[PDB]
Amino acid sequence: QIRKPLLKSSLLDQNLTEEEVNMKFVQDLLNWVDEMQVQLDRTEWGSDLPSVESHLENHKNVHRAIEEFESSLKEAKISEIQMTAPLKLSYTDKLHRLESQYAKLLNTSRNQERHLDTLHNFVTRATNELIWLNEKEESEVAYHAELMRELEQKEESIKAVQEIAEQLLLENHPARLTIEAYRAAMQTQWSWILQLCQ
C-alpha cells in the first residue's frame, strides 16, 4: 500500500551529473510527500472493532514509512552542499518546500495515530460492556441480592466508559460519530438491563 522513495543509486545507469540526479531526487521526495498526504487526508476510522483494528494497523505501516522517510530527508538536506549554480537556487527551494511539507504530515500522521489509538481503546471498552450487558439478558432473564450487588459494581465501570466518551467528544475526536454511537448504545442497554430487575 506504500512506495519507497527513490534511491539515488537507481539513477546511475541513467547518465546524468551528480547535481542532475539530486534534482530528480528532491522531486521524487516532494512527490512522495504529496501522495502520502492524500492517502492520509483520505484516512478512515472505522465504525466497529474489527474495522478500527484494521485502520489502526494500516495506519501503523503508513506511520512507520513516514518515519523512515527521514533518512531520505537527511540525504536531501546534505545534498544542498553538492549543489552549484545554476541548479542550486532551484534545489534549495524544493528542499525547503520538502522540509516544510514533510513536517506537516508526520505531524498529521501523529495525530491520526493518537486518534486511532483512543478510538481503539474506547471501542474495545464499549464493546466489552455491551457484551456483558447483552449476555446479562440471559441471566437475570431465564439471587438476589448478590445480583443487585453485581449491578452496583458494573455501574462504576460503565459509568466510566461514559466519562471517556464524554471526554473524547469534548476534545472533538474525528471519529466523533462512531464514539457517540457506542456511548448511546451502551447507555441504552444498561438502562434496560436495570429496568429488568427494576
mmCIF file of C-alpha atoms in Angstrom:
data_model
loop_
_atom_site.group_PDB
_atom_site.id
_atom_site.type_symbol
_atom_site.label_atom_id
_atom_site.label_comp_id
_atom_site.label_asym_id
_atom_site.label_seq_id
_atom_site.Cartn_x
_atom_site.Cartn_y
_atom_site.Cartn_z
ATOM 1 C CA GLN A 1 0.000 0.000 0.000
ATOM 2 C CA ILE A 2 3.081 2.454 0.025
ATOM 3 C CA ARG A 3 6.124 3.122 -2.180
ATOM 4 C CA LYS A 4 9.760 3.588 -1.204
ATOM 5 C CA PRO A 5 11.242 6.999 -2.001
ATOM 6 C CA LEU A 6 13.602 6.525 -4.867
ATOM 7 C CA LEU A 7 17.234 5.669 -4.271
ATOM 8 C CA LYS A 8 19.844 7.935 -5.810
ATOM 9 C CA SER A 9 21.734 4.792 -6.779
ATOM 10 C CA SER A 10 18.783 3.795 -9.004
ATOM 11 C CA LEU A 11 19.650 6.652 -11.372
ATOM 12 C CA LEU A 12 23.252 5.786 -12.202
ATOM 13 C CA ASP A 13 22.917 3.804 -15.397
ATOM 14 C CA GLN A 14 20.974 6.704 -16.339
ATOM 15 C CA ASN A 15 23.789 9.108 -17.132
ATOM 16 C CA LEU A 16 23.308 12.478 -15.546
ATOM 17 C CA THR A 17 25.509 14.652 -13.360
ATOM 18 C CA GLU A 18 25.643 14.445 -9.569
ATOM 19 C CA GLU A 19 23.530 17.632 -9.386
ATOM 20 C CA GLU A 20 21.180 16.466 -12.100
ATOM 21 C CA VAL A 21 20.329 13.368 -10.020
ATOM 22 C CA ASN A 22 19.915 15.474 -6.925
ATOM 23 C CA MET A 23 17.186 17.411 -8.740
ATOM 24 C CA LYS A 24 15.197 14.249 -9.630
ATOM 25 C CA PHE A 25 15.762 13.023 -6.131
ATOM 26 C CA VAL A 26 14.416 16.017 -4.352
ATOM 27 C CA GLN A 27 11.495 15.978 -6.782
ATOM 28 C CA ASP A 28 10.633 12.331 -6.169
ATOM 29 C CA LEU A 29 10.756 13.121 -2.499
ATOM 30 C CA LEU A 30 8.388 16.044 -2.856
ATOM 31 C CA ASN A 31 6.115 13.761 -4.889
ATOM 32 C CA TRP A 32 6.297 11.073 -2.193
ATOM 33 C CA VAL A 33 5.231 13.536 0.492
ATOM 34 C CA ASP A 34 2.306 14.752 -1.673
ATOM 35 C CA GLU A 35 0.922 11.306 -2.457
ATOM 36 C CA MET A 36 1.364 10.319 1.185
ATOM 37 C CA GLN A 37 -0.604 13.334 2.334
ATOM 38 C CA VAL A 38 -3.573 12.455 0.105
ATOM 39 C CA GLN A 39 -3.840 8.854 1.299
ATOM 40 C CA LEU A 40 -3.803 10.394 4.761
ATOM 41 C CA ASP A 41 -6.439 13.065 4.249
ATOM 42 C CA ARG A 42 -8.363 10.142 2.825
ATOM 43 C CA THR A 43 -7.993 8.181 6.182
ATOM 44 C CA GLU A 44 -10.990 6.396 7.643
ATOM 45 C CA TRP A 45 -11.525 5.482 11.286
ATOM 46 C CA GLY A 46 -13.903 2.535 11.213
ATOM 47 C CA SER A 47 -17.246 2.062 12.812
ATOM 48 C CA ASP A 48 -16.771 -1.208 14.669
ATOM 49 C CA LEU A 49 -13.958 -3.003 16.494
ATOM 50 C CA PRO A 50 -12.683 -5.101 13.599
ATOM 51 C CA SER A 51 -12.611 -2.111 11.227
ATOM 52 C CA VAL A 52 -10.964 0.050 13.844
ATOM 53 C CA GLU A 53 -8.236 -2.585 14.359
ATOM 54 C CA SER A 54 -7.845 -2.642 10.615
ATOM 55 C CA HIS A 55 -7.467 1.089 10.030
ATOM 56 C CA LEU A 56 -5.232 1.203 13.102
ATOM 57 C CA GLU A 57 -2.928 -1.491 11.766
ATOM 58 C CA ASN A 58 -2.988 0.015 8.276
ATOM 59 C CA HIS A 59 -2.035 3.293 9.763
ATOM 60 C CA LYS A 60 0.766 1.660 11.760
ATOM 61 C CA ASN A 61 2.528 0.886 8.470
ATOM 62 C CA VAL A 62 1.755 4.238 6.999
ATOM 63 C CA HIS A 63 3.239 5.977 10.054
ATOM 64 C CA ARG A 64 6.297 3.713 10.090
ATOM 65 C CA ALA A 65 7.037 4.507 6.473
ATOM 66 C CA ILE A 66 6.637 8.235 7.154
ATOM 67 C CA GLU A 67 9.217 7.917 9.949
ATOM 68 C CA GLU A 68 11.833 6.014 7.983
ATOM 69 C CA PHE A 69 11.329 8.604 5.274
ATOM 70 C CA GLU A 70 13.568 10.837 7.388
ATOM 71 C CA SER A 71 16.733 9.174 6.130
ATOM 72 C CA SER A 72 15.887 10.427 2.704
ATOM 73 C CA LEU A 73 15.032 13.865 4.055
ATOM 74 C CA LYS A 74 18.505 13.968 5.608
ATOM 75 C CA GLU A 75 20.102 12.947 2.329
ATOM 76 C CA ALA A 76 18.198 15.702 0.628
ATOM 77 C CA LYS A 77 19.363 18.157 3.319
ATOM 78 C CA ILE A 78 23.044 17.273 2.994
ATOM 79 C CA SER A 79 22.816 17.271 -0.806
ATOM 80 C CA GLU A 80 22.431 21.029 -0.931
ATOM 81 C CA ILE A 81 26.169 21.164 -0.274
ATOM 82 C CA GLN A 82 26.798 19.261 -3.509
ATOM 83 C CA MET A 83 24.729 21.874 -5.343
ATOM 84 C CA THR A 84 26.041 24.623 -7.600
ATOM 85 C CA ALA A 85 24.859 27.492 -9.819
ATOM 86 C CA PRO A 86 22.658 27.361 -11.966
ATOM 87 C CA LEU A 87 20.683 24.456 -10.426
ATOM 88 C CA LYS A 88 21.263 25.369 -6.765
ATOM 89 C CA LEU A 89 18.645 28.061 -6.397
ATOM 90 C CA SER A 90 16.022 25.728 -7.730
ATOM 91 C CA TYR A 91 17.206 22.948 -5.464
ATOM 92 C CA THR A 92 17.183 24.960 -2.210
ATOM 93 C CA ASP A 93 13.654 25.954 -3.000
ATOM 94 C CA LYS A 94 12.462 22.406 -3.402
ATOM 95 C CA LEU A 95 14.388 21.275 -0.332
ATOM 96 C CA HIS A 96 12.786 23.972 1.764
ATOM 97 C CA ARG A 97 9.350 23.162 0.470
ATOM 98 C CA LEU A 98 10.030 19.485 1.217
ATOM 99 C CA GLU A 99 11.226 20.254 4.754
ATOM 100 C CA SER A 100 8.020 22.088 5.390
ATOM 101 C CA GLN A 101 5.612 19.698 3.654
ATOM 102 C CA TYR A 102 7.199 16.763 5.439
ATOM 103 C CA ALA A 103 6.756 18.377 8.803
ATOM 104 C CA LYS A 104 3.012 18.679 8.081
ATOM 105 C CA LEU A 105 2.434 15.006 7.560
ATOM 106 C CA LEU A 106 4.156 13.380 10.455
ATOM 107 C CA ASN A 107 2.549 15.987 12.446
ATOM 108 C CA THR A 108 -0.700 14.766 10.754
ATOM 109 C CA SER A 109 0.448 11.159 10.901
ATOM 110 C CA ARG A 110 0.978 11.542 14.658
ATOM 111 C CA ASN A 111 -2.434 12.980 15.393
ATOM 112 C CA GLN A 112 -4.020 10.293 13.367
ATOM 113 C CA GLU A 113 -2.001 7.733 15.212
ATOM 114 C CA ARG A 114 -3.090 9.023 18.619
ATOM 115 C CA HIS A 115 -6.712 9.345 17.437
ATOM 116 C CA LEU A 116 -6.828 5.814 16.160
ATOM 117 C CA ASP A 117 -5.408 4.825 19.470
ATOM 118 C CA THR A 118 -8.014 6.478 21.711
ATOM 119 C CA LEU A 119 -10.690 5.258 19.336
ATOM 120 C CA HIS A 120 -9.484 1.712 19.646
ATOM 121 C CA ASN A 121 -9.368 1.796 23.388
ATOM 122 C CA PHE A 122 -12.836 3.294 23.619
ATOM 123 C CA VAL A 123 -14.456 0.903 21.148
ATOM 124 C CA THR A 124 -12.841 -2.080 22.838
ATOM 125 C CA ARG A 125 -14.300 -0.917 26.120
ATOM 126 C CA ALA A 126 -17.787 -0.162 24.994
ATOM 127 C CA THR A 127 -17.820 -3.451 23.093
ATOM 128 C CA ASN A 128 -16.986 -5.461 26.154
ATOM 129 C CA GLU A 129 -19.566 -3.698 28.259
ATOM 130 C CA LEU A 130 -22.152 -4.265 25.560
ATOM 131 C CA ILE A 131 -21.232 -7.951 25.528
ATOM 132 C CA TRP A 132 -21.657 -8.186 29.277
ATOM 133 C CA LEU A 133 -24.948 -6.343 29.122
ATOM 134 C CA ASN A 134 -26.269 -8.488 26.294
ATOM 135 C CA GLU A 135 -25.448 -11.777 27.990
ATOM 136 C CA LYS A 136 -26.967 -10.452 31.271
ATOM 137 C CA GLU A 137 -30.189 -10.548 29.292
ATOM 138 C CA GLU A 138 -29.711 -14.302 29.680
ATOM 139 C CA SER A 139 -29.252 -14.445 33.128
ATOM 140 C CA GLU A 140 -31.358 -12.242 35.013
ATOM 141 C CA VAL A 141 -33.689 -13.426 32.282
ATOM 142 C CA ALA A 142 -34.150 -17.191 32.440
ATOM 143 C CA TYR A 143 -30.166 -14.386 43.962
ATOM 144 C CA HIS A 144 -30.906 -11.833 44.866
ATOM 145 C CA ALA A 145 -29.441 -9.832 46.316
ATOM 146 C CA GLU A 146 -25.946 -10.699 45.059
ATOM 147 C CA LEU A 147 -27.336 -9.781 41.593
ATOM 148 C CA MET A 148 -28.333 -6.191 42.503
ATOM 149 C CA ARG A 149 -24.920 -6.103 44.217
ATOM 150 C CA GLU A 150 -23.234 -7.133 40.901
ATOM 151 C CA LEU A 151 -25.165 -4.435 39.032
ATOM 152 C CA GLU A 152 -23.866 -1.812 41.522
ATOM 153 C CA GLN A 153 -20.289 -2.768 40.633
ATOM 154 C CA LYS A 154 -20.885 -2.700 36.851
ATOM 155 C CA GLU A 155 -22.282 0.854 37.145
ATOM 156 C CA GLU A 156 -18.903 2.134 38.435
ATOM 157 C CA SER A 157 -17.249 0.500 35.444
ATOM 158 C CA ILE A 158 -19.909 1.505 32.928
ATOM 159 C CA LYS A 159 -20.032 4.902 34.472
ATOM 160 C CA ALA A 160 -16.617 5.153 33.184
ATOM 161 C CA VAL A 161 -16.686 4.253 29.593
ATOM 162 C CA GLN A 162 -19.265 7.031 29.655
ATOM 163 C CA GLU A 163 -16.713 9.570 31.028
ATOM 164 C CA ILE A 164 -14.244 8.545 28.334
ATOM 165 C CA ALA A 165 -16.705 9.196 25.505
ATOM 166 C CA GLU A 166 -17.713 12.471 27.047
ATOM 167 C CA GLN A 167 -14.062 13.441 27.127
ATOM 168 C CA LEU A 168 -13.139 12.341 23.610
ATOM 169 C CA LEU A 169 -16.207 14.129 22.289
ATOM 170 C CA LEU A 170 -15.420 17.336 24.194
ATOM 171 C CA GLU A 171 -11.980 17.095 22.556
ATOM 172 C CA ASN A 172 -13.711 16.781 19.157
ATOM 173 C CA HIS A 173 -12.393 13.423 18.071
ATOM 174 C CA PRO A 174 -12.508 12.966 14.325
ATOM 175 C CA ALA A 175 -14.372 9.697 14.896
ATOM 176 C CA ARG A 176 -16.981 11.605 16.961
ATOM 177 C CA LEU A 177 -19.821 9.799 15.137
ATOM 178 C CA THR A 178 -18.844 6.253 15.896
ATOM 179 C CA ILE A 179 -17.928 7.158 19.505
ATOM 180 C CA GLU A 180 -21.293 8.685 20.255
ATOM 181 C CA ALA A 181 -22.784 5.580 18.628
ATOM 182 C CA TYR A 182 -21.151 3.182 21.090
ATOM 183 C CA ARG A 183 -21.762 5.543 24.001
ATOM 184 C CA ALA A 184 -25.507 5.735 23.402
ATOM 185 C CA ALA A 185 -25.821 2.014 22.607
ATOM 186 C CA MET A 186 -24.168 1.182 25.908
ATOM 187 C CA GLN A 187 -26.243 3.608 27.936
ATOM 188 C CA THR A 188 -29.376 2.289 26.248
ATOM 189 C CA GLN A 189 -28.698 -1.330 27.094
ATOM 190 C CA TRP A 190 -27.624 -0.538 30.650
ATOM 191 C CA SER A 191 -30.759 1.465 31.158
ATOM 192 C CA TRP A 192 -32.817 -1.538 30.029
ATOM 193 C CA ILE A 193 -30.946 -4.149 31.989
ATOM 194 C CA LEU A 194 -31.576 -2.078 35.130
ATOM 195 C CA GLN A 195 -35.190 -1.865 34.237
ATOM 196 C CA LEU A 196 -35.474 -5.624 34.145
ATOM 197 C CA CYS A 197 -34.524 -6.072 37.824
ATOM 198 C CA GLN A 198 -36.162 -2.661 38.472
#
